[PDB]
A paper describes a structure:
The lactose permease of Escherichia coli (LacY) catalyzes β-galactoside/H+ symport across the membrane, using an alternating access mechanism. LacY is the most extensively studied symporter in the Major Facilitator Superfamily and a paradigm for defining transport mechanisms. The protein consists of two 6-helix bundles (an N- and a C-terminal domain) connected by a relatively long cytoplasmic loop. LacY alternates between inward (cytoplasmic)-open and outward (periplasmic)-open conformations, each of which can bind or release cargo, and according to the kinetic scheme, multiple conformers are involved in the overall transport cycle.
We here report the 2.8Å structure of LacYWW complexed with a third nanobody, Nb9043 and containing TDG, a high-affinity lactose analog, bound at the sugar-binding site. The crystals were in space group P65 and contain two complexes of LacYWW/TDG/Nb9043 in the asymmetric unit with unit cell axes a = 151.3Å and c = 182.6Å. In each complex, a molecule of TDG is observed in the substrate-binding site and Nb9043 is bound to the periplasmic surface of the C-terminal domain. In both complexes, the cytoplasmic side of LacYWW is closed and the periplasmic vestibule is partially occluded. As in previous Nb/LacYWW complex structures, the CDRs of Nb9043 interact with the ends of periplasmic helices and connecting loops in the C-terminal domain of LacYWW, but Nb9043 is shifted ~7Å toward the N-terminal domain in the open periplasmic cavity of LacYWW relative to the Nbs in previous structures. The only interactions between Nb9043 and the N-terminal domain are a hydrogen bond from His35 Nε2 in TM1 donated to Asp103 O™2 in CDR3, and a close contact between Asp36 (LacYww) and Asp103 (CDR3) side chain carboxyl groups. In both complexes two n-Nonyl-β-D-glucopyranoside (β-NG) molecules are bound near the periplasmic vestibules, one at the interface with the Nb and one adjacent to the substrate binding site.
Numbering used by the authors:
A (entry chain C): 1 to 121
B (entry chain A): 1 to 189, 203 to 409
């Protein structure tokens, strides 16, 4: 029905930015509000940011409320997550997810993001 | 016409209140009751929609014929009330369990019960209370008003206890059914002006029934299929999704109160203007809501576009009955209402919710709502000339 392919992850040093993307295949991207989730080892999955279909409304978790910016391009059916001043705590697998009602009804495989403690105290 | 000391205005005003309280638990939140509590496919909801649609198509024609044959004796409302007293056991102990074992036979059991009590039962009650409205000198709109509140009141109670106890509302709905029986108990109720089935079926030969049905299929049915997936479209404007529902919840609950208020004055409004222009105004409000949703981009704009429903309903429900009683023999009021506005809508609804559903996936919501918006706006303006009545420009 809907396919979500996350891209752009990697490993970076503490304090640097990294932008991730999500390719929307299948049914109309514009019909779905979307969000980003992350999962670290030994911690529960948490929602980082969500956005309506148009981009008129965005909600960020208080953990990243100032650093991350959620973007979308419905002409190109892609969903982005700019992540600034990343910290080792922000090391996790970041998932792209599509929301129908209250249930996020489609997920991507996820992209691993690793942040080193070296180069920032 | 009097209202305060009118015993039957209260018995049937209340009857509207508690009846639509009962159906409030079932209908507006049916998709979430199925997918969230019973963990049912969406593959399979099309089977439920088909079952209800199929048994509704069978029940609604007979409900209209029996409604007129019975006239006011109210024998069928006694039957419907008895079935609503099982509202709770049916949902909790029958429908849910049966569908998880096998969905197809849960859909026949649910198709029969719901198609009888609500898809056909609600129009049958409305048609009856309209007959009583003419005998007991009270406007049909002023008694129907009650149903808006009962519907809203129940929408509030279920939202509060969604987290706590989901079954509570259904049990209250059964209690409401016993309230209805008490009201029905105390409500007070050779002739060729009487209903005759032979001449009922010759209604098909007259053309103003065809053009009325054209309005229903072209406008009301197009509008009802637009509203079926509007809930998810509404929440898609909200990033949180939890506030998308809660804003949705607030607008439905308090919006229905405006619906009742507009319907308080709608009889006086509709009596001065035509019963036709009530429908064309209703169709106009319908079309604006649909088209407006394709261009909408903001959370605020759709709170407005979901509030537009509350302006449309009073002139469509009060107007359609004024139009039926004005331009047809009023011994056929219920027959005309449940065949044109229900059966034909429900028949067209089968074909255009697959065409609606298939456009949501091919093109966007916005493109889909643009198409239906023009089908509805087109058939609304076709009926500016086609329906039988004064017309809009008589008021200039
Ligand atoms: O859709 C099922 C039935 O709905 C009403 S119209 C519907 O009425 C309730 C109760 O008053 C709410 O206000 C809704 O806002 C309004 O849309 C029809 O009259 C019935 O025949 C059924 O069609
Ligand atoms: C009568 C209702 C009018 C609707 C107008 C909606 C205004 C936006 C409210 O939405 C919420 O605001 C929060 C910030 O205040 C955001 O963090 C959150 O993402 C968003 O979901
Ligand atoms: C729960 C909702 C309660 C709604 C109550 C509806 C009140 C309608 C009042 O109408 C008025 O009643 C008077 C006495 O009957 C009439 O003299 C008068 O002509 C009429 O305008
Ligand atoms: C969610 C379960 C599937 C429900 C199927 C929805 C079809 C309901 C059709 O209702 C019709 O709506 C009109 C209001 O405009 C009334 O005039 C008419 O009498 C009534 O029959
Ligand atoms: C009587 C109502 C029956 C509903 C039948 C649905 C027909 C086509 C389903 O399209 C669906 O539209 C949703 C918008 O809410 C999307 O979220 C969902 O991904 C998409 O699959």
């Amino acid at each position: 029905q809907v396919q979500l392919v996350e891209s752009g992850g990697g490993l970076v040093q503490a304090g640097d930015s990294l932008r991730l993307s999500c390719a929307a295949s299948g049914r109309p991207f514009s019909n779905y509000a979307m969000g980003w989730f992350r999962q670290a080892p030994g911690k529960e999955r948490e929602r980082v940011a969500s956005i309506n279909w148009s981009g008129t409304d965005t909600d960020y978790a208080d953990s990243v409320k100032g650093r991350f910016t959620i973007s979308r391009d419905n002409a190109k059916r892609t969903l982005y997550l700019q992540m600034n001043t990343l910290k080792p705590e922000d090391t996790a697998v970041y998932y792209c997810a599509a929301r129908v009602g209250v249930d996020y009804k489609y997920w991507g495989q996820g992209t691993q993001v690793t942040v080193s403690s070296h180069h920032h105290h | 016409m009097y209202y305060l000391k009118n015993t039957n205005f209260w018995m049937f005003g209340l009857f509207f209140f508690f009846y639509f309280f009962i159906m409030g638990a079932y209908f507006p939140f049916f998709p979430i009751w199925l997918h969230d509590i019973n963990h049912i496919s969406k593959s399979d909801t099309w089977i439920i929609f088909a079952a209800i649609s199929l048994f509704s198509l069978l029940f609604q024609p007979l409900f209209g014929l029996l409604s007129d044959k019975l006239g006011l004796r109210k024998y069928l409302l006694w039957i419907i009330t008895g079935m609503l007293v099982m509202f709770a056991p049916f949902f909790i102990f029958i429908f849910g369990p049966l569908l998880q074992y096998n969905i197809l036979v849960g859909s026949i059991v649910g198709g029969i019960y719901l198609g009888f009590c609500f898809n056909a039962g609600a129009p049958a009650v409305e048609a009856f209370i309209e007959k009583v409205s003419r005998r007991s000198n009270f406007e049909f709109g002023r008694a129907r008003m009650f149903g808006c509140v009962g519907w809203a009141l129940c929408a509030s109670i279920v939202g509060i206890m969604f987290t706590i106890n989901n079954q509570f509302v259904f049990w209250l709905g059964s209690g409401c059914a016993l309230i209805l029986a008490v009201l029905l108990f105390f409500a007070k109720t050779a002739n060729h002006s009487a209903f005759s089935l032979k001449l009922a079926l010759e209604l098909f030969r007259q053309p103003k029934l065809w053009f009325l049905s054209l309005y229903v299929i072209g406008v009301s049915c197009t509008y009802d299929v637009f509203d079926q997936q509007f809930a998810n479209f509404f929440t898609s404007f909200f990033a949180t999704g939890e506030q998308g529902t809660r804003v949705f919840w607030y607008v439905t609950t308090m919006g229905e109160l405006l619906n009742a208020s507009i319907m308080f004055f709608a009889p006086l409004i509709i009596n001065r203007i035509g019963g036709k222009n009530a429908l064309l105004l209703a169709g106009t409000i319908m079309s604006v809501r649909i088209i407006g949703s394709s261009f909408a981009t903001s959370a605020l704009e759709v709170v407005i576009l979901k509030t537009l429903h509350m302006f449309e309903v009073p002139f469509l429900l009060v107007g359609c009955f004024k139009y039926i009683t004005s331009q047809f023999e009023v011994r056929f009021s219920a027959t005309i209402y449940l065949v044109c506005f229900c059966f034909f809508k429900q028949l067209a609804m089968i074909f255009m919710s697959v065409l609606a559903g298939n456009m949501y996936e091919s093109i966007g919501f916005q493109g889909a709502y643009l198409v239906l918006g023009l089908v509805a706006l087109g058939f609304t303006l076709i009926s500016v000339f086609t329906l039988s009545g004064p017309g809009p420009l008589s008021l200039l």
